[PDB]
Design a protein around this ligand. Structure first.
Ligand SMILES: Nc1ncnc2c1ncn2[C@@H]1O[C@H](COP(=O)(O)OP(=O)(O)O)[C@@H](O)[C@H]1O
Ligand code: BEF
Ligand SMILES: [Mg+2]
Ligand SMILES: [Zn+2]
Ligand SMILES: [Zn+2]
Ligand SMILES: [Zn+2]
Ligand SMILES: [Zn+2]
Ligand SMILES: [Zn+2]
Lengths: 445, 608, 10, 355, 292, 96
DNA sequence: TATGTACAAC
DNA sequence: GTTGTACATA
């Protein structure tokens, strides 16, 4: 979803803006790395030659087996408008964008770049002691604040407004508190690369008059910069952007000089399992994780009992599951966490259990399940316990002079989807509070 | 906290249970054991090397809590430690093994607890001579510790036969836990009995392991052997009696179970019938041979007030002789208020206790320590299930929604009358009938249990099937059981609390529950045992069944989740069935129309 | 695992 | 001392690898794989069982055998119900043997073994083998007893007369007849009877047998073998193959009769002329000019460079973490030494050094 | 999909490129090749941010690792370019400057045998080190100049043929780019064909970037889906031992496996001093039988 | 299917004679000449059969399948004629 | 302490 | 068939 999410946004931006976005080679070098491997191969073939190559020639390069990948590569390249198709004399000639072409040539051949990659002050700082600690503490604060665990230093208003504006960490003044949402749980389960891009995409969507092109010229350029070195300061809009990014733990700037951090490089590309847990039929949990994050997220729907340096053991209980559902976490997500973070032993036993059921019949009687069915049934059964009684706010309509009138008003509510219950014998029906005004207005007319 | 130990930001979620202050050893990937430095709980990885080497050592020193598929969980307590030392074990061996198998270093708190629970074993020994109990000791120094004891009163002193239960319990508190060993090899005063296991016998591995923990040093150890229901505890007792080669007495908590001992006993060993005698309410003749066998029940041995002239002679016959071996079947009932007197009246050199479940509601379970001895061996239920020794079971818990007509009275009525009200709900009748029909078409033998006699008879008459309960005579119930085993027409039978334990039905393969005792977890395990010995327990794809019909939104659900707290520990998984497929298409169902349902409500409320 | 089915009655 | 213990163990292991003389080895081989499928193979000493593990390693051995000995032949025999059952004829196709082994994996082993029956069958399969090929039998024995219909001693004498060689891999302990069979057949050497002590040792034993067996000095079979190097062709239309009589798009063309073949290296089905590629012969050059072992350089003397000559790895700063080649006198890291003598077969320093 | 390591093996020597310049009309063409290589390496670093670069130069008296620089700053290139690209390009040129000056010092030194086999062997060792250290692919590129008339390539057979098998074990395609008069190199061509590599021969140094970016830019992650632009067809044949002519059908000694187009003189092998039995060799000498 | 099976049938038998002819031709024993002559005659007949099959396909399928039929059996036919040509050349050298 | 149920005896 | 007594649980 990393390259898809960034790519998808770039397909929405008007082409008139994409052409201007390709002016800075720093952005093009990063945009070049997001395309599929086939796209990069074709782009590198067209960049160095100032000529038009027919689409048929490109098709010849790909083998019959890899024909499917060719359709995706061209579709993604054409959607970004990086590839300009023109037909002349019955030949579907294919060319490269001149702005993108020039930008790549300068980057590879080291031509004039107008400081797209920035400059270096030659005043390096220790990265392990400061950059790692600074971003790790800053990233930990936002993560812990999201998980809901108590923590002294709360995030600044900038990111806090971003969270509330987004589906992350729903907050209500009347309640006076904040809690995780359905999307919040998914965000916490996403890797660091995705955990950062989602916040940036929300920030880029919430930005209102810095300049859109300037924002991207900074985000992509940040990936170009290498961690552990100084960089002199840039656009007027980017200055406040740099300060804003300082609150997300991506850059360190004390009190004229800013320094990128591990997360800045993590944005561009990527970089037993930590987090794998065993769930028994006794509703117990034994997680092989040693980290404040993996433990904190488990506490959302688990009742932790003790901790060891190498593992944490807990117990699934009705109170814990109820505590998670009250915050809006769906049971379907809980099983996903337990399924996607299962220990190899559970998978091996399930495969052996499935293997003992594979040769017997083609149907196999079951798909592979890592964790015992009873845990799923109890978790889903508890969710039903929360929806035991259903209440709707609305009004009851009665005392109808004529049956036709009762059917007319009741049928109208059904048409607009605001009818919740009706009874022909009693000439009574109930409608949701949302549709009350419409029904009353229809009644008068 | 033997360090700076900076707490983690999430350490608050663990209230004084954070055990991160200690560090991990470099060989963690091999060592399978985690030890809790505070509560004594031990977590074992059953999927790692040295797991088998620890599954037996931990059982010896620690009582299991839960043993699911992958991760086991033991716990060290004074009771469990007492058992290990009694069989013979020093703190050095336990510490060496525990440290060698622990991913983390053994904390001082656990070391102190184990060291504190150390005994000078073998100093005091209780012996029997001509029905006289002498507390003999191997050194004279012990005399200053015993003769000067407040409670009491190559050196020995006399003690009253009935007062043995006082000295033994006192011996538990003065740091000298007495041991009851028997040198049957060197015992010539008692007339020997020549009985041996016939060549056709084949002792299973776990049976040999259980006996080795008893006769490991050559002297018959007095203790308790715990094996899953249907594991063959009867043959374990037979082998123990056969190897001891002395007069033996057996006590079992029924008359049907007494008979099945005699049948199995005459089968597995060569003890001729002339040397066997059964002491029950039907017949009371005793063997005239020099050394023989007596198989009886607690109810016939524990009565004190009034005994019949024919049964008083038998009791004198039992008491007069100095028996050489006593086997207590279902030993979870011996520490009762009166049943424990069977241990003081009938003199016996070696006492063996056989039971599948070693739990009970009250705290008297620990009384077994000073009555018959410690716990010698315990076997995992799942281990024997995967080896084909006992049948696998797919347990289930069916939720039968109570109808509005009956549920409206379930609220107003009192507690003592609620039980009979949610046991006879019409939906349960439909569920039971459908399941019985489905399994009967499957060629299965079904057993139905009901702690309520009124419900049992009502169900039996409605379905026209036989039932057994307290008032049933011995001959009738024995005939019913035999027919249910061999008769093709009799596919299913209704049982009650009488057959809840110690009845052998190899043909049974399915079990259904419509009623149950209030909250006893032991009864659930014992009932499940009836089907764990199914004959066709090895054919491919076989799966026995155990249904528990309960009433939705009733106090029975409170007990059902509490009545299966022991099976879950052993590893059994209970699933919830909210609907029975193909149940509506059945032609006829009981109380299908409102008229019949209303009639039942008026009929049941009359008794209320 | 049948959890979303109708009531067991009849 | 823990780190020192590992180094001395490595030095001891290197001791056996220090004496590398260019022994004359028979590159062209003819192997017969006798596997045991009897009641004794139903034990659980090797998880899951002896039969399963042996077959699995046999498949891996087949893959390795043909990869390093492309111009050799192999056959497979199984001992079942006191009789020898043939499951694969002597052939150079690695896929046929693997297919036979997979089929055997299903049938349960039962009965008693018979070395004489298996050896007698091996004597027959190897009879139509040229005099320039080394006739070898690799028996994987698992039982402690042998039930035979005749005198095993007579068969052992017959094997020696036919210049056959036998390697026996036992499972439980030594057997007197197997020791005599391997000793009287290998010119008195007693190193050809190996008993595994665990699963890991078993993998090494099969892997060791892949290498060619050095020949004896008094056993001379020198000769010239008529070989052929075909040229691959690319045809537009499918054509019938001369070996399987099926339609294949490609295939090599024999230089003696122009008949086409599907895969190499195989003997031409028309002129009975062996067809091979230059690569097939190059695979065995390292068995005729083995690379001289590298000797640990003492820390007393001074070193040339701080980094490896081949991989440019900083030498970790007691013991010198450098290995030098006498021919070129260039230091090497510990990692390179393993890769230069196992995967590669040429010293980069020697090639780089001009002459 | 995944990062891929690129290991370039450039064969630079005064005797090779000087002949290339004299034969043609291009002076200083080595500069053109060096600039093309610098651009090519930068392009590889642009395909992904997790792929490394390695350059090994085979000079007249040995080999030298141009990049990465040994642990043991004139401005050839402008500093305006990307930091990562500059960090590699600048080091490469500086090592080039050092090596050529060293070569100029030993110009009078006698070097008769090329050092291409050693460089390829060293590159394979580097590939293993990267693979074992730190899930990374690999690719070898041999940029050799064949214009210079080689003395004898026979000694390059045994080493090069050994690299083929090693390269096939680590899934490391080796591509070869040859700049010289000879159209085909029977040893290099076999190396590319048997290792899923690409062999390309170019006569003109100018426009080399187009060839490099269009032919040798295929990463290991997408080899199965791109058809190689290789045009030449190899025969996988070897020359005789005492005649030097390719043999389609001949005789090989069973002891040393040395090819012989004809029966060796003296009825004795010329490579291992092994005497062939007179009767057995006479069998080969027999002629076809036709009815009288 | 019928034509394809016949082609394989003809191909299999033609190669069998080719194998036998080469075995008896490269044996080096003079006595084998008599057998070689018989095998040589069989090869000549095989050529006629292959040509006849092509004619049968040519006039049966109207050249639609003859081109494919010849291609499927082109290598085998080429091998047979080469074997006969080698026999004739050596026969001319030896006898003539 | 009360209440079911099962058991032995008269 | 009934009365005096245990055991197992609220
Ligand atoms: N070794 C054995 N051989 C044959 N049958 C056995 C063996 N051990 C136990 N059984 C059978 O197991 C069943 C249950 O035995 P039993 O001793 O009544 O079990 P438990 O008392 O442990 O519930 C009986 O059918 C018995 O014959
Ligand atoms: F443990 Be058994 F059912 F007597
Ligand atoms: Mg029993
Ligand atoms: Zn073929
Ligand atoms: Zn041929
Ligand atoms: Zn190295
Ligand atoms: Zn060397
Ligand atoms: Zn030779």
């Amino acid at each position: 979803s990393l390259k898809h999410s960034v790519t998808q946004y770039l397909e929405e931006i008007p082409q008139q803006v994409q052409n201007r976005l390709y002016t800075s080679p720093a952005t093009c070098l990063a945009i070049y790395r997001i395309l599929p491997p086939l796209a990069k191969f074709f782009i590198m073939a067209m960049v160095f030659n100032e000529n038009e190559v027919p689409l048929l020639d490109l098709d010849k390069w790909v083998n019959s087996n890899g024909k499917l990948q060719f359709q995706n590569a061209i579709k993604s390249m054409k959607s970004l408008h990086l590839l300009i198709p023109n037909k002349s004399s019955g030949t579907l000639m294919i060319n490269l964008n001149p702005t993108f072409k020039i930008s790549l040539r300068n980057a590879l051949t080291g031509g004039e770049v107008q400081n797209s990659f920035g400059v270096v002050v030659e005043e390096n700082v220790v990265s392990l002691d400061l950059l790692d600690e600074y971003s790790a503490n800053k990233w930990e604060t936002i993560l812990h604040f999201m998980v809901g665990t108590p923590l002294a230093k709360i995030p600044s208003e900038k990111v806090l407004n971003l969270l509330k504006h987004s589906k992350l960490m729903e907050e209500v003044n009347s309640t006076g508190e904040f809690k995780i949402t359905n999307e919040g749980f998914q965000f916490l389960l996403q890797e660091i690369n995705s955990q950062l891009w989602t916040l940036l995409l929300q920030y880029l969507k919430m930005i209102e008059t810095m300049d859109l092109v300037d924002v991207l010229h900074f985000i992509f350029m940040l990936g170009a910069l290498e961690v552990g070195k100084a960089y002199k300061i840039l656009s007027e809009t980017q200055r406040i952007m740099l300060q804003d990014m300082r609150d997300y733990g991506l850059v360190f700037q004390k009190h004229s000089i800013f320094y990128p951090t591990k997360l800045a490089l993590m944005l561009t590309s990527d970089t037993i399992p930590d987090g794998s847990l065993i769930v028994e039929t006794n509703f117990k949990i034994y997680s092989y994780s040693n980290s404040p994050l993996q433990i904190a997220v488990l506490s959302l729907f688990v009742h932790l009992k003790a901790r060891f340096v190498n593992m944490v053991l807990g117990q699934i209980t009705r109170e814990s599951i109820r505590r998670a559902l009250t915050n809006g976490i769906t049971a379907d997500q809980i099983i996903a966490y337990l399924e996607t973070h299962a220990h190899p032993q559970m998978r091996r036993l399930a495969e052996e259990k499935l293997e003992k059921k594979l040769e017997l019949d083609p149907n196999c009687k079951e798909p592979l399940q890592v964790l015992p069915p009873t845990v799923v049934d109890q978790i889903r059964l508890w969710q039903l316990e929360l929806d035991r009684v259903i209440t709707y706010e609305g009004s009851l309509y009665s005392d109808f002079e004529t049956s036709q009138e009762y059917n007319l008003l009741s049928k109208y509510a059904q048409d607009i989807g605001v009818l919740l219950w009706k009874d022909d014998k009693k000439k009574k029906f109930f409608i949701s509070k949302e549709g009350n005004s419409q029904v009353l207005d229809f009644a008068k007319r | 906290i033997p360090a700076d130990f900076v707490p983690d930001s999430v350490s608050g979620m663990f209230r004084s249970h954070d055990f991160s202050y200690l560090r991990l050893r470099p060989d963690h990937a091999s060592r399978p054991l985690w030890i809790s430095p505070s509560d004594g709980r031990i977590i074992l990885e059953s999927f790692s090397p040295l797991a088998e080497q620890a599954q037996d050592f931990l059982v010896t020193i620690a009582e299991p809590i839960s043993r699911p598929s992958h991760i086991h969980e033991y716990k060290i307590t004074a009771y469990s430690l007492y058992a290990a030392v009694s069989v013979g074990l020093e703190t050095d061996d336990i510490i060496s093994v525990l440290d060698r198998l622990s991913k983390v270093p053994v904390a001082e708190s656990i070391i102190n607890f184990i060291k504190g629970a150390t005994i000078s074993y073998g100093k005091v020994k209780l012996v029997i001579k001509h029905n006289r109990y002498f507390v003999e000791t191997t050194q004279a120094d012990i005399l200053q510790m015993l003769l000067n004891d407040s409670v009491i009163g190559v050196h020995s002193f006399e003690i009253a036969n009935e007062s043995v239960e006082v000295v033994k319990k006192r011996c538990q508190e003065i740091d000298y836990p007495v041991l009851e060993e028997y040198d049957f090899r060197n015992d010539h005063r008692n007339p020997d009995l020549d009985i041996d296991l016939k060549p056709s016998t084949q002792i299973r591995p776990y049976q040999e392991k259980s006996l080795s923990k008893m006769f490991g040093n050559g002297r018959a150890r007095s203790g308790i052997i715990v094996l899953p229901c249907g594991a063959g505890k009867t043959l374990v007792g037979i082998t123990a009696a056969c190897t001891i080669k002395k007069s033996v007495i057996v006590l079992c908590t029924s008359s049907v179970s007494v008979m099945q001992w005699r049948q199995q006993f005459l089968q597995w060993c060569t003890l001729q019938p002339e040397n066997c005698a059964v002491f029950t309410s039907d017949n009371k003749e005793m063997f005239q041979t020099e050394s023989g066998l007596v198989v009886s029940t607690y109810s016939m041995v524990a009565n004190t007030r009034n005994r019949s002239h024919d049964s008083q002679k038998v009791m004198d016959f039992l008491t007069g002789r100095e028996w050489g071996f006593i086997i207590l079947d279902e030993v979870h009932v011996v520490p009762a208020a009166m049943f424990r007197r069977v241990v003081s009246t009938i003199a016996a050199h070696a006492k063996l206790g056989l039971t599948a479940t070693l739990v009970r509601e009250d705290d008297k379970i620990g009384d077994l320590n000073f009555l018959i001895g410690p716990k010698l061996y315990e076997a995992n239920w799942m281990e024997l299930s995967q080896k084909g020794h006992i049948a696998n079971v797919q347990c289930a818990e069916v939720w039968c929604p109570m109808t509005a007509e009956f549920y409206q009275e379930y609220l107003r009525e009192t507690a003592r009358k609620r039980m009979l009200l949610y046991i006879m709900n019409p939906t349960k009748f439909q569920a039971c009938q459908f399941l019985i029909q489905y399994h009967e078409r499957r060629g299965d033998k079904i057993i139905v249990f009901s702690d309520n006699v009124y419900a049992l008879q009502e169900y039996a008459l409605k379905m026209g099937k036989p039932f057994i309960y307290g008032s049933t005579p011995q001959q009738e119930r024995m005939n019913i059981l035999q027919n249910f085993q061999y008769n093709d027409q009799i596919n299913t039978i209704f049982l009650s609390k009488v057959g809840d334990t110690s009845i052998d039905l190899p043909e049974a393969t399915c079990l259904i529950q419509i009623s149950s005792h209030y909250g006893s977890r032991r009864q659930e395990a014992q009932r499940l045992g009836r089907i764990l010995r199914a004959k066709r327990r090895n054919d491919e794809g076989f799966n026995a069944f155990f249904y528990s019909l309960v009433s939705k939104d009733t106090q029975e659900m409170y007990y059902s989740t509490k009545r299966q707290a022991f099976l879950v520990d052993q590893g059994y998984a209970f699933k919830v069935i909210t609907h029975l497929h193909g149940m509506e298409n059945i032609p006829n169902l009981a109380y299908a129309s409102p008229r019949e349902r209303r009639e039942l409500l008026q009929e049941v409320l009359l008794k209320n | 695992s049948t959890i979303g089915k109708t009531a067991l009655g009849r | 001392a823990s780190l020192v213990a590992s180094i001395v163990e490595a030095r001891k292991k290197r001791t056996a690898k220090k004496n590398i003389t260019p022994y004359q080895r028979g590159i062209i081989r003819s192997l017969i794989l006798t596997l045991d499928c009897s009641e004794a193979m139903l034990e659980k000493d090797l998880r899951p069982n002896r039969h399963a593990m042996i077959i699995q390693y046999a498949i891996d051995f087949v893959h390795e055998f043909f990869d390093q000995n492309p111009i050799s032949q192999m056959g497979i025999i199984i001992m079942r119900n006191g009789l020898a059952q043939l499951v694969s004829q002597v052939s150079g196709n690695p896929q046929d043997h693997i297919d036979a082994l997979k089929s055997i994996r299903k049938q349960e082993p039962k009965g008693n073994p018979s070395l004489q029956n298996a050896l007698e069958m091996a004597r027959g399969l190897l009879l139509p083998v040229p005099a320039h090929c080394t006739r070898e039998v690799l028996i994987v024995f698992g039982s402690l007893s042998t039930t035979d219909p005749g005198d095993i001693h007579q068969t052992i004498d017959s094997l020696v007369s036919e210049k056959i060689r036998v390697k026996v891999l036992g499972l439980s302990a030594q057997v007197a007849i197997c020791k005599e069979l391997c000793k009287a057949t290998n010119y008195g050497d007693e190193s050809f009877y190996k008993i595994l002590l665990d699963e890991t040792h078993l993998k090494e034993l099969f892997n060791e047998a892949v290498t060619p067996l050095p020949v004896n000095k008094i056993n001379k079979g020198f000769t010239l073998v008529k070989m052929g190097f075909p040229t691959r062709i690319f045809e537009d239309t499918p054509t019938f193959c001369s070996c399987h009589s099926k339609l294949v798009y490609g295939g090599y063309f024999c230089p003696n009769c122009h008949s086409k073949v599907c895969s190499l290296p195989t003997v031409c089905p028309c002129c009975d002329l062996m067809l091979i590629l230059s690569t097939h012969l190059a695979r065995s050059y390292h068995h005729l000019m083995p690379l001289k072992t590298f000797a640990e350089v003492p820390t007393t003397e001074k070193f040339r460079s701080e980094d490896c000559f081949s991989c440019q790895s900083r030498f970790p700063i007691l013991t010198s973490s450098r290995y030098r080649c006498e021919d070129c006198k260039q230091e090497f890291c510990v990692d390179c030494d393993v890769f230069i003598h196992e995967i590669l077969h040429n010293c980069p320093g020697c090639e780089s050094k001009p002459v | 999909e995944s990062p891929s390591l690129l290991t370039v093996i450039i064969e630079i020597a005064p005797k090779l490129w000087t002949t290339f310049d004299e034969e043609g009309n291009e002076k200083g063409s080595i500069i053109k090749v060096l600039e093309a290589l610098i651009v090519f390496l930068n392009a590889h670093l642009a395909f992904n941010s997790a792929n490394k670069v390695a350059v090994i130069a085979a000079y007249s008296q040995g080999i030298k690792y141009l990049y990465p620089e040994s642990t043991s700053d004139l401005k050839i290139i402008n500093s305006d370019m990307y930091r990562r690209f500059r960090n590699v390009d600048e080091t490469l040129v500086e090592e080039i400057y050092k090596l050529f000056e060293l070569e100029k010092k030993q110009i009078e030194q006698n070097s008769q045998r090329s050092t291409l086999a050693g460089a390829m062997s060293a590159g394979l060792t580097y590939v293993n080190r990267i693979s074992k250290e730190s899930s990374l692919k690999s690719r070898l590129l041999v940029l050799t100049c064949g214009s210079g008339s080689s003395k004898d390539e026979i000694f390059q057979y045994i080493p090069i043929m050994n690299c083929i098998f090693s390269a096939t074990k680590m899934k490391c395609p080796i591509d070869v780019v040859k700049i010289g008069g000879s159209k085909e190199s029977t040893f290099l061509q076999q190396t590319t064909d048997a290792t899923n590599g690409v062999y390309l021969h170019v006569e003109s140094t100018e426009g080399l970037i187009q060839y490099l970016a269009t032919a040798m830019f295929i990463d290991p992650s997408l080899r199965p889906i791109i058809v190689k632009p290789n045009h030449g067809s190899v025969d996988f044949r070897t020359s005789c031992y005492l005649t030097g002519r390719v043999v389609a059908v001949g005789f090989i000694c069973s002891v040393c496996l040395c090819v012989l187009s004809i029966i060796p003189p003296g009825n004795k092998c010329p490579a291992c001093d092994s005497q062939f039995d007179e009767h057995v060799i006479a069998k080969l000498k027999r002629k076809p039988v036709v009815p009288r | 299917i019928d034509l394809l099976e016949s082609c394989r049938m003809l191909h299999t038998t033609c190669c069998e004679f080719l194998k036998h002819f080469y075995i008896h031709f490269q044996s080096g024993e003079q006595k084998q000449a008599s057998t070689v002559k018989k095998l040589y005659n069989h090869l000549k007949d095989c050529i006629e059969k292959l040509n006849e099959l092509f004619q049968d396909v040519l006039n049966g399928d109207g050249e639609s399948m003859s081109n494919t039929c010849t291609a499927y059996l082109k290598p085998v036919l080429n091998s047979i004629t080469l074997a006969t040509h080698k026999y004739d050349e050596y026969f001319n050298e030896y006898n003539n």
